Amino acid sequence: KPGKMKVKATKGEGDGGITSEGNALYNNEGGRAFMYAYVTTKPGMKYVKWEHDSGVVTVELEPPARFVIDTPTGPQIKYLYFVKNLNNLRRGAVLGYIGATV
Amino acid sequence: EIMPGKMKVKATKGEGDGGITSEGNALYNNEGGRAFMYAYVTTKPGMKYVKWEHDSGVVTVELEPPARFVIDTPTGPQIKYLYFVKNLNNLRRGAVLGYIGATVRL
């Protein structure tokens, strides 16, 4: 199941009211959307407000890792923010999904 | 760092104890220095080993008991068997699952 990774466009927030657009990478482990990571162009993000029907959770982000994607004009850097306390299995699923897609 | 999640596929052959044989894909990383097989995917249960070429050579790579998963095909769903190599760490197992999820129609 960790393999069935899905992407949802979502806003990120950081100190001082700064914001980003980006994608949450997430998995429906048994009928509840579990965010694993957030990817964006922008540094300094701290959290994402993540929607469940039961209500919104603010998901805290680790310090980001920088990574490379391919573009029409060459490599560009994006930031990958794992959710706090994500385990190694789920981190690996994020990296594998990214490696296969970007 | 996406390096440990980076993955390539190579067509290869598996074996189980009692003469069992299979064809399938090895998922491996050759991140920088050597080829490191992470997993083997095939259509058959009961595989125990994969015959991994390296050098020129053939290496026998031991497998964990498989997880079954299902893919869409032109003729409908097909059961596949995912065998991690023995003692693959959780980060790398996760990388295998993420890569399969990204590339296969599950």
Side-chain angles (χ1 to χ4, degrees):
Chain A
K1 282 165 231 206
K4 299 180 173 174
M5 304 280 332
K6 293 179 168 194
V7 173
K8 167 164 184 192
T10 347
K11 146 192 200 89
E13 292 111 320
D15 308 308
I18 65 170
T19 66
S20 58
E21 272 275 56
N23 284 325
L25 307 185
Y26 75 97
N27 183 286
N28 295 308
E29 277 137 5
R32 177 67 96 87
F34 187 137
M35 189 176 160
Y36 291 3
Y38 180 63
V39 172
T40 180
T41 283
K42 303 213 334 186
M45 297 305 108
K46 295 277 185 295
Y47 66 93
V48 171
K49 294 189 268 186
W50 181 248
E51 183 192 2
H52 305 114
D53 295 338
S54 48
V56 184
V57 162
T58 137
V59 178
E60 294 198 339
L61 304 180
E62 299 196 332
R66 280 156 75 262
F67 73 102
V68 175
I69 70 157
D70 309 280
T71 84
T73 50
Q76 82 137 127
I77 301 310
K78 292 187 82 161
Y79 288 85
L80 168 60
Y81 295 84
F82 282 119
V83 301
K84 287 193 184 309
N85 295 339
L86 201 68
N87 70 7
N88 283 336
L89 192 66
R90 298 175 168 108
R91 292 173 188 256
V94 171
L95 305 171
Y97 168 91
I98 288 165
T101 54
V102 303
Chain B
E1 179 95 63
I2 329 286
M3 279 303 214
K6 168 189 170 206
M7 220 156 299
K8 279 163 188 77
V9 170
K10 173 195 270 174
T12 200
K13 303 291 161 49
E15 293 180 356
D17 271 309
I20 286 174
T21 264
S22 67
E23 319 212 309
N25 280 338
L27 290 162
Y28 69 103
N29 201 168
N30 58 174
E31 35 216 304
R34 218 95 160 220
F36 177 171
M37 182 177 159
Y38 289 177
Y40 176 70
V41 177
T42 180
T43 53
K44 307 196 28 184
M47 298 305 145
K48 298 278 200 263
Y49 301 101
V50 158
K51 308 301 237 141
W52 191 227
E53 129 188 76
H54 229 259
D55 284 322
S56 23
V58 185
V59 170
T60 305
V61 171
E62 184 147 24
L63 303 180
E64 311 244 314
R68 292 166 59 229
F69 68 103
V70 170
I71 64 160
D72 204 22
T73 77
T75 55
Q78 177 177 53
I79 296 143
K80 303 300 285 273
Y81 288 87
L82 168 60
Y83 299 79
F84 295 114
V85 298
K86 189 154 80 174
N87 287 337
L88 187 69
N89 79 6
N90 284 328
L91 179 72
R92 294 170 163 79
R93 280 178 200 241
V96 163
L97 295 173
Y99 167 94
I100 288 168
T103 59
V104 151
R105 30 41 264 246
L106 282 172

